[PDB]
Design a protein around this nucleic acid. Structure first.
Length: 54
RNA sequence: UUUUUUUUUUUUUUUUUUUUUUUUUUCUCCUCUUUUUUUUUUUU
């Protein structure tokens, strides 16, 4: 279990997409929670063309 | 001078069967009178 306290936004997302890429090597599912609508779809768009299905 | 968030119309389909109209009651029951019985025959 990991807690992170930093300043840059995407800098914290590296471990997030590490876990996301690790899930398809384990075939499991992961849940990402974003409490705002604008940011909620940007990450989906980022990972759609990047890989897999979101 | 009034921002931000609260998903949506149950899943399923590629199961066998070798009979035949109907169907089941009603009891014994005093017949009145000119008769033997006439008769061939011919014209259809």
């Amino acid at each position: 279990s990991v807690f992170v306290a930093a300043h840059t936004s995407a800098g914290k997302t590296v471990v997030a997409e590490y876990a996301i890429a690790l899930a398809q090597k384990h075939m499991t599912r992961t849940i990402y929670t974003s409490p705002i609508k604008a940011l909620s779809n940007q990450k989906f768009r980022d990972f759609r063309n990047t890989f897999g299905d979101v």
